[PDB]
Design an enzyme around this catalytic site. Structure first.
Site, short mmCIF file in Angstrom:
data_model
loop_
_atom_site.label_atom_id
_atom_site.label_comp_id
_atom_site.label_asym_id
_atom_site.label_seq_id
_atom_site.Cartn_x
_atom_site.Cartn_y
_atom_site.Cartn_z
N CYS A 249 3.56 1.85 9.30
CA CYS A 249 3.45 0.67 8.43
C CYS A 249 4.81 0.19 7.96
CB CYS A 249 2.50 0.91 7.26
SG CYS A 249 0.86 1.50 7.77
N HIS B 140 0.81 -1.21 0.00
CA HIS B 140 0.00 0.00 0.00
C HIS B 140 0.86 1.29 0.00
CE1 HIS B 140 -0.30 -0.05 4.57
NE2 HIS B 140 0.07 1.20 4.32
N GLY C 10 2.51 6.34 9.62
CA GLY C 10 3.93 6.25 9.32
C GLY C 10 4.58 4.99 9.86
C1 LIG Z 1 1.15 3.29 7.60
N1 LIG Z 1 2.31 3.83 7.56
C2 LIG Z 1 -0.04 4.21 7.43
N2 LIG Z 1 0.13 5.52 7.66
C3 LIG Z 1 -0.93 6.32 7.46
C4 LIG Z 1 -2.17 5.84 7.06
C5 LIG Z 1 -2.24 4.48 6.86
N3 LIG Z 1 -1.20 3.65 7.03
#
Ligand SMILES: *C(=N)c1ncccn1
Ligand SMILES: *C(=N)c1ncccn1
Lengths: 304, 304
Positions: free
Chosen positions: A145, A41, A143
């Site tokens: 993820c 994503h 941030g």
């Molecule tokens: C992951 N890093 C993330 N950040 C913001 C929205 C969704 N996912």
């Protein structure tokens, strides 16, 4: 003595964290050998997340669109591919700090440490468990993820989780390092509700043994039960059924304390029916289920 | 979202852990620059611990009696000295992995991460707080002495604790890196009883703000209180008195949530008087006091 919710030392994993940017999205990647693993994503805009077609979105991306930075130095991306819900970015440099590693898919009830990262930089480490509904209760902000879950066996890191998303209920969903989500979750911004978050019975029993080893013994009663009788109570309280496999796994803790597994089940049965009455066990007012029998043995023996 | 008992990433500290052996005693040391810091009780036999005269015992020790091993390579000891309850072993090699560091003496209520080690090898990392009675509730087995407590500010490690002992009640005592014990404890195997382990009120309030930020809001009531009224209740429940300094420190959390500090005190006052009624806050059935207001801000903002 003393029993704490302990995470593995995170150093070996810190040496693998990198920042991955695609367009305006920045998240974390895991750099092992000459491959950087990250949630697919990263190619989505917050809008694309509503109904993304990852194969189609990926056609518009080239190696030079994936910006990978390890510390403050840029890595050169010489290939990219999608494996399930993760992207594998081939870089021209092997990570010199790559530890011995494995990719493992864990089962519910298993615990692991999470190294929460932002912009490829570690912020904190904590201990989690894969819930029976295949969610985890983490601490993840925007941030985070690409942050990973892992276990360590002496010098080999077994990576088991990569963070992808937060459900509308504040619980977390992610994949193994092959990109397969735990549970039925999908990397899409849609109505995804988690199932029943039952209690991991075998872990509660392990933690009760840890309590006995560490001197907290008030909950020990004069009773015993059977697997079938205990399980009727476990079902009533949304606890996972206890199997003979779980009893066998608790064997070493039963041997060390001299408390038969079924006697400990009877103690747990009374705690479920009577409550804690304002008392605590290992500094907790609830029955802790995020320590496996292996974690209790590991911590009670000082495995390094 | 989500709020976890998070430790700092331990990598920078793992790179400092060494094994120190004197006679038949092996414990951990901290190698920073060309000095290895370790508890002075490394020179004692379990018998000497009953009434040790450290200056006298140290006269019988030479540099070659202190065996320091970093990984599987031996360090050469070219000097030794005692500073309060720690020994400083000068080695001929500066630790190449020495991070930017400071030695800080923390106050009660302050939290820190502990890297539990055995034989100079890291076993786990967890988060602790210096209790108001100057003990810590850790997880330490025999061989863990010399394990350290620390905080990290971006790239500088502030070492605040070194493990020395377990009291007969299973709680832990240690020193700062200048060798001064926290509290009245001494490195001697004698009757040392800890004082009242009161609750760190300002940390509970910080954690209630963290709960509101993360969606757990059931405990918010329609009341307010004053510092003096709240403190009468705090005294009754063995909670530390709340000062205007604590109210000022909670200012940023009050601003972010729009909940005045004294209104949160009134919520905490009702939780103390009425109990939790079987409910939980941030997955806990008791009021958590091992998160400082700084930890809540740090975790809720993702400081790396
Ligand atoms: C992951 N890093 C993330 N950040 C913001 C929205 C969704 N996912
Ligand atoms: C610390 N390493 C320690 N081990 C055994 C007994 C006492 N202290």
């Amino acid at each position: 003595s003393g029993f704490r919710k302990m995470a593995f030392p995170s150093g070996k994993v810190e040496g693998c964290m990198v920042q991955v940017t695609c367009g305006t999205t920045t998240l974390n990647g895991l750099w092992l050998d000459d491959v950087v693993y990250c949630p697919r994503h990263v190619i989505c805009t917050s809008e694309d997340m509503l109904n993304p077609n990852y194969e189609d979105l990926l056609i518009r991306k080239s190696n030079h669109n994936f910006l990978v930075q390890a510390g403050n130095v840029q890595l050169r991306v010489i290939g990219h591919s999608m494996q399930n819900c993760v992207l594998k970015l081939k870089v021209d440099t092997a990570n010199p700090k790559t530890p011995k590693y494995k990719f493992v898919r864990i089962q519910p009830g298993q615990t692991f440490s999470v190294l929460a990262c932002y912009n490829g930089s570690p912020s904190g480490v904590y201990q989690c468990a894969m819930r029976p509904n295949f969610t985890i209760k983490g601490s993840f902000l925007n941030g985070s993820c690409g942050s990973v879950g892992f276990n360590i066996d002496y010098d080999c890191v077994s990576f088991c989780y990569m963070h992808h998303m937060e459900l509308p209920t504040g619980v977390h969903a992610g994949t193994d390092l092959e990109g397969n989500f735990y549970g039925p979750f999908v990397d899409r911004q849609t109505a995804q509700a988690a199932g029943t978050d039952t209690t991991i019975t075998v872990n509660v029993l392990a933690w009760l043994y840890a309590a006995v080893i560490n001197g907290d013994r008030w909950f020990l009663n004069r009773f015993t039960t059977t697997l079938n009788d205990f399980n009727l109570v476990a079902m009533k309280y949304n606890y996972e059924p206890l199997t003979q496999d779980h009893v066998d796994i608790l064997g070493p803790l039963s041997a060390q304390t001299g408390i038969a597994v079924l006697d400990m089940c009877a103690s747990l049965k009374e705690l479920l029916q009577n409550g804690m009455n304002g008392r605590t066990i290992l500094g907790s007012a609830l029955l802790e289920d995020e320590f496996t029998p292996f974690d209790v043995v590991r911590q009670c023996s000082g495995v390094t």
